[PDB]
Ligand binder design. Structure first.
Ligand SMILES: [C]O[C]1[C](OP([O])(=O)O[C][C]2O[C](N3[C]=NC4=C3N=C([N])[N]C4=O)[C]([O])[C]2[O])[C]([C]OP([O])(=O)OP([O])(=O)OP([O])(=O)O[C][C]2O[C](N3=[C]N([C])C4=C3N=C([N])[N]C4=O)[C]([O])[C]2[O])O[C]1N1[C]=NC2=C1N=[C]N=C2[N]
Ligand SMILES: Nc1ncnc2c1ncn2[C@@H]1O[C@H](CSCC[C@H](N)C(=O)O)[C@@H](O)[C@H]1O
Length: 259
């Protein structure tokens, strides 16, 4: 058993009030009140982020932890926050975005956010059975939370296997992907094997809620994986009992128009 396993048990043991105070204490939160209503009313001419995912990828890029370029694939694009971020980047030439859609899942939001014309959205696509194709940058933000840590571990293992398949097709591609449950030993083993062949490392974005242990793997950073995970678990465990709220910041606005 790991510290993150204990974190997950302590999380599930929270009362409702305990859970909601813990969830958001100390985290960066974009201000989505304008964005939310524009999406709700169906405004397509907008550059405000279509989801909270945009600011997370923006943070990874601005830190230099990912370098989005060339032909980008977005595996599990959901509403498209990563696809629109990538399409607005001058070094990106095109985005192929894929998501399952269906009941309980987000379909792509269609807006004129800068570079939208460079995105080819395909909904109703399962990426886990899709044949990989050429890409310079491979992005994947898949990993659905579960109260069951073993399910979160297996969901995470499937994402890492997917990234191995896309690296097999594209050994030189940069990769960035969500690791939902890095605290699980089957996940650590798979991350080690990936890191040994492809390099890379783990990082926590300051926008992730304390109710998830998610971290992001990128081929462009480094770091011992176990220590990265353990630092994050201790930091998550140390926030239990904190009552401070979130730090609110402006939402990303990419502007509108074609590229
Ligand atoms: C009920 O549940 C709930 C839900 O879930 P889902 O997701 O829907 O899934 C379902 C599933 O799972 C499982 N389970 C459940 N339960 C149980 C189980 N298992 C066992 N073994 N046992 C038990 O008990 C099964 O398999 C089924 O089928 C959830 C909700 O969520 P949503 O809405 O979806 O959102 P998201 O995105 O996910 O986010 P969040 O919210 O933040 O979450 C994350 C995490 O956290 C936690 N939580 C949540 N919540 C809401 C809560 C919590 N915790 C606490 N303590 N409290 C509260 O309230 C978890 O871990 C998650 O993952 O959730 C759930 N829940 C509710 N409640 C509860 C829960 N869990 C645990 N515990 C509790 N108390
Ligand atoms: N097997 C699969 N094939 C395709 N899409 C999947 C999938 N499993 C999960 N997904 C989708 O992957 C998406 C992950 S959410 C990603 C958030 C996104 N990066 C943003 O910025 O908006 C979800 O919408 C989920 O429906």
């Amino acid at each position: 058993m790991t510290l993150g396993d204990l974190w997950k048990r302590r999380l599930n043991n929270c009362t409702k009030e305990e859970f909601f105070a813990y969830r958001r204490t100390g985290i960066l939160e974009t201000e989505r009140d304008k964005a939310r209503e524009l999406l709700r009313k169906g405004e397509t001419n907008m550059g405000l982020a279509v989801s909270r995912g945009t600011a997370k990828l923006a943070w990874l890029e601005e830190r230099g932890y990912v370098n989005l370029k060339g032909e980008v694939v977005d595996l599990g694009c959901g509403r498209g926050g990563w696809s629109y971020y990538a399409a607005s980047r001058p070094a990106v030439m095109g985005v192929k975005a894929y998501t399952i859609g269906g009941k309980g899942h987000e379909a792509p939001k269609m807006v004129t956010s800068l570079g939208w014309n460079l995105i080819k959205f395909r909904a109703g696509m399962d990426v886990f059975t899709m044949q990989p194709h050429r890409a310079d940058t491979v992005m994947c933000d898949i990993g659905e939370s579960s109260p069951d840590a073993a399910i979160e571990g297996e969901r995470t293992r499937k994402v890492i296997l997917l990234m191995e398949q896309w690296k097999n097709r594209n050994p030189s591609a940069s990769c960035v992907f969500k690791v939902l449950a890095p605290y699980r030993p089957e996940v650590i083993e798979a991350l080690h094997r990936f890191q040994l062949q492809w390099g890379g490392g783990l990082v926590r974005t300051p926008f992730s809620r304390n109710s998830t242990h998610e971290m992001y793997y990128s081929t462009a950073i480094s770091g011992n994986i176990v220590n990265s995970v353990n630092v994050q678990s201790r930091k998550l465990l140390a926030r239990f009992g904190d009552q401070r709220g979130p730090i609110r910041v402006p939402e990303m606005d990419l502007g509108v128009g074609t590229r």
